[PDB]
Design a protein around this ligand. Sequence first.
Ligand SMILES: Cc1cn([C@H]2CCCN(S(=O)(=O)c3ccc(O)c(Oc4cccc(Cl)c4)c3)C2)c(=O)[nH]c1=O
Ligand SMILES: Cc1cn([C@H]2CCCN(S(=O)(=O)c3ccc(O)c(Oc4cccc(Cl)c4)c3)C2)c(=O)[nH]c1=O
Lengths: 198, 196
Amino acid sequence: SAFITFEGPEGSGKTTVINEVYHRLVKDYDVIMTREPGGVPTGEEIRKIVLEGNDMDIRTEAMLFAASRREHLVLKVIPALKEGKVVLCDRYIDSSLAYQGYARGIGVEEVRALNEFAINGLYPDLTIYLNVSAEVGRERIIKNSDQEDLKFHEKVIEGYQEIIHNESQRFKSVNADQPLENVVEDTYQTIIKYLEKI
Amino acid sequence: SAFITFEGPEGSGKTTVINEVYHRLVKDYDVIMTREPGGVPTGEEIRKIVLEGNDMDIRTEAMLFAASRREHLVLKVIPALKEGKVVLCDRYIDSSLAYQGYARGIGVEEVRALNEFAINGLYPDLTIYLNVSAEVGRERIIKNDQEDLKFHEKVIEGYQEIIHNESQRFKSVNADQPLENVVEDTYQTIIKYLEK
Ligand SMILES: Cc1cn([C@H]2CCCN(S(=O)(=O)c3ccc(O)c(Oc4cccc(Cl)c4)c3)C2)c(=O)[nH]c1=O
Ligand SMILES: Cc1cn([C@H]2CCCN(S(=O)(=O)c3ccc(O)c(Oc4cccc(Cl)c4)c3)C2)c(=O)[nH]c1=O
């Protein structure tokens, strides 16, 4: 079994990369792809509170992402890993660390302690980081889909750099500045090399 | 202003004590009575998930009590304190520590770290612990099963460990006395604090 998470800011091509990689992996492995809340009812209900929120306090928001994470982990991830599956998860702990911790300003270590309570030692086996420059990311955002948004995008990227710097061995950084066909190939090859080594 | 929390297991006379102590403090203080979620919409929505849940994972439950606590703190407690109010809060951090931490078995220090994230340094100014024996507590519960009895005992045991740990904001009131005396001791303890 393998627990693989995918991380990156907006404009990293993450959605496209995960879907294409997953599609290729389904041929050779017992693999599932998911994201939080992922249809788990308690998680979907927590997510509705987050979306229905009016200027929600960032710590309440962090605690709700962490509660949704646990429900999804407990009801979807853990049962699949117990069946010997490769689990591909779109966003996990590192998303809370970069967005809530770094970009929102709660502090990475504080959001980590919160998330360690939620995951209870279930860290990913491998994390694919879709390493897109802020400039390429910005251009992908305007293309494929104000000024405060630009700075928030940069801080998310800066947040992911600090996370990798403090925990490199868990991470595999993929050049997301390349055309998406190449990002897909590099991500697939990185995963295959990991899966065939275990 | 003052943030005063009330802690204790069921059967400690907590409801009666808070209401009566509120009735006496209002003469001299701008005081409010509250409990989480306390009408805060986001908190009420979180509480509905907790109550509507079926065999919910204890850590998700702990994280939801902590999320409801923050919403209540941010939208009710803090604005009340800013107005100069005495805030009487029925259950706060120590309840998560005794119930989720100790009695449910997650571990007190783990639930503390979770709750320190939620309160972000906003510890109570004073915490009234209504120190009732399990036996007196049990009798008060029946007046107002084996698994329930054992859970009640573990909650009390949990509060003993918490009180043993931190000794500054905690004030232990003998809740084995008749309720009139528990009310008087609690009121006098609060007055001594508010005056000094
Ligand atoms: C998993 C995760 C995601 N994000 C963001 C990634 C980028 C998109 N945002 S968003 O607020 O625009 C958003 C987009 C789609 C959503 O569907 C959403 O709602 C939730 C998603 C997952 C879990 C929960 Cl509780 C809500 C929020 C979420 C965080 O800030 N922290 C996390 O832990
Ligand atoms: C504040 C608090 C209370 N409790 C319990 C105290 C005894 C009663 N229980 S209960 O689960 O039986 C319960 C009774 C009535 C309720 O109304 C309730 O729902 C909530 C109360 C406060 C906050 C939230 Cl999110 C739900 C739960 C909650 C905890 O276990 N942890 C805490 O942090």
